[PDB]
Design a protein around this ligand. Structure first.
Ligand SMILES: [Cl-]
Ligand SMILES: [Cl-]
Ligand SMILES: [Cl-]
Ligand SMILES: [Cl-]
Ligand SMILES: [Cl-]
Ligand SMILES: [Cl-]
Lengths: 329, 324
């Protein structure tokens, strides 16, 4: 019926978007990490489906939405658990070992990382610059959770970022790769991950571009979901009264558990709340208490409004195809 | 990722093109046939797959070209027999029973008739307009058959043009439907084949001055129509021959549904409705050259907004750099 998956809606447009990305990268010569000049500020929003009928809804949802990860994260009260906030929806992402990049790229630009532009930029930073501060931060985080050979393990993580064949086409990436990536984008990344109930994953949590001053970074996050070694973007649904925000804590039975903030130094961790407020637009939302009567204020970060112009938006072209195809029923 | 139909390089743009088509149909009050205002004057050409690594040249062909029908028509010496004119290539067409329209739509607009705009336009004329003259021409052509072994036949032809389920999804179409179609387009249709569907269909319900004088060219084999488009950019003549070699002589392509007075002036009619040129070709005696008639083919002219092969071509170029 409709396209069988998003990218088919305007292939020429996708190519145009992809072709713009490597030209937006600025490569300094004073040792500052390479980074995007403008495109990191873009954000996708998904269109509403409620106006359509179940046979149609079904084909749009089977086409665009990863309903398996969406159900897993919702059923654990990790995704879409606050009544105050706008729904997020998981978009299908290719599972080829480059999905961290495909999901990040879709969240901003509605296309996956099929030219390997983000993957290469990550590997180039890891391979060709001094990474001593990234290494230190990762050592600290490694020791907060046998005999470690630091040099050998660091070299392996650099190797994992390469485009070389080893979830089979590329090596899977892990936390440090997310942290380096957010510094290339100058934009925080928040990962909502599958995780065992405390009564019984470490990739979940908040990655800040700490190698830049907050004033030089975009202050709405990219929001990804993670499950079974797979990343997806979790994009906001157009709707208020509900507000665009993502909670920065999870429920844990009758208490709350802060999302992990990754790769901090010790003094940063002491002023974590202050740091979060610099790099994100942190608001407080009242939620129902699962121990005490009434209510508890929790921190959340504001999410961006859709700003990805039509001329670079597969989702807009997709929706216009939907409308055409719809009115014929 | 190299799509199997030109339109899929940009499905959003395909929809825009299809949406333009019914609005371009003019529907007179005085009983004259409904007809396109402007869009009938568009022509698609295919891009060259040489000037690519033959390895990659071959990836595109499996993607876009109906090579089964190209080889059949070429081995029968009907398609691309003449070494003096440009090569024509058969584009893949949906075989759902609406392929006459999918092929015709693709030749002009690079999209298939998937909203049924042309198919509905045909049925509308046959079920609404009067068609007295069409039926007469059809009777005359039908009675030329030297032997006959008969009149619910006209109503069933009308029914065949409907969008009703028959079998494929739609009823297959025949010669008379081609003739009505060329008059809705005000543009000749030429069908290359080995149903005697092959030949030339002229929009004779219109004076030639109101018609577009480059043809639509289709191929036909095994109940299936495809467009035969010009391959873009050597120095061969941009024209389709109006004869074939047949047993050591040149035989004219059939011209369909003419009246007696029209038949007596067939060559003059061809010269009014087409751009006829007289070109030299090699004889069977290699010491001899012959002049034959050919009709000029149009140059590619689909504008930016609804030009689609350029979008497909851009995809190809991006993919090829990554392939080098
Ligand atoms: Cl776990
Ligand atoms: Cl976490
Ligand atoms: Cl020849
Ligand atoms: Cl011969
Ligand atoms: Cl013929
Ligand atoms: Cl001869």
């Amino acid at each position: 019926v409709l396209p069988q998956a998003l990218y088919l809606s305007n292939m020429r447009k996708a190519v145009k978007i992809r072709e713009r990305t490597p030209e937006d990268i600025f490569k300094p010569t004073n040792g500052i990490i390479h980074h995007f000049k403008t495109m990191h500020r873009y954000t996708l929003e998904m269109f509403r489906t409620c106006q359509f009928c179940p046979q149609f809804r079904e084909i749009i949802h089977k086409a665009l939405i990863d309903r398996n990860i969406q159900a897993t994260l919702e059923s654990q009260k990790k995704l879409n658990w606050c009544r105050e906030v706008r729904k997020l929806v998981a978009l299908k992402t290719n599972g080829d070992g480059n999905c961290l990049m495909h999901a990040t790229s879709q969240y901003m630009w509605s296309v996956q990382d099929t030219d390997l532009v983000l993957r290469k930029a990550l590997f180039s930073t890891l391979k060709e610059t001094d990474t001593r501060n990234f290494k230190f931060r990762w050592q600290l985080e490694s020791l907060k959770s046998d005999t470690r050979n630091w040099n050998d393990e660091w070299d392996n993580l650099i190797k994992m970022a390469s485009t070389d064949t080893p979830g089979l086409q590329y090596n899977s990436l892990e936390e440090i790769h997310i942290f380096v990536l957010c510094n290339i984008l100058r934009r925080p990344i928040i990962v909502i991950s599958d995780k065992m109930l405390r009564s019984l994953l470490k990739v979940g949590g908040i990655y800040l571009p700490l190698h830049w001053p907050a004033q030089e970074c975009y202050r709405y996050p990219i929001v990804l979901g993670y499950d079974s070694h797979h990343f997806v973007p979790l994009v906001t649904l157009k709707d208020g009264p509900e507000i665009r925000a993502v909670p920065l804590v999870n429920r844990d039975r009758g208490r709350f558990e802060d999302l992990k903030v990754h790769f901090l130094t010790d003094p940063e961790n002491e002023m974590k709340e202050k740091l979060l407020k610099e790099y994100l637009m942190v608001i407080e939302i009242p939620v129902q208490g699962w121990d005490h009567g009434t209510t508890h204020l929790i921190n959340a970060a504001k999410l961006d409004e859709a700003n990805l112009p039509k001329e670079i938006n597969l989702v807009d072209d997709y929706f216009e195809l939907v409308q055409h195809e719809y009115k014929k029923w």
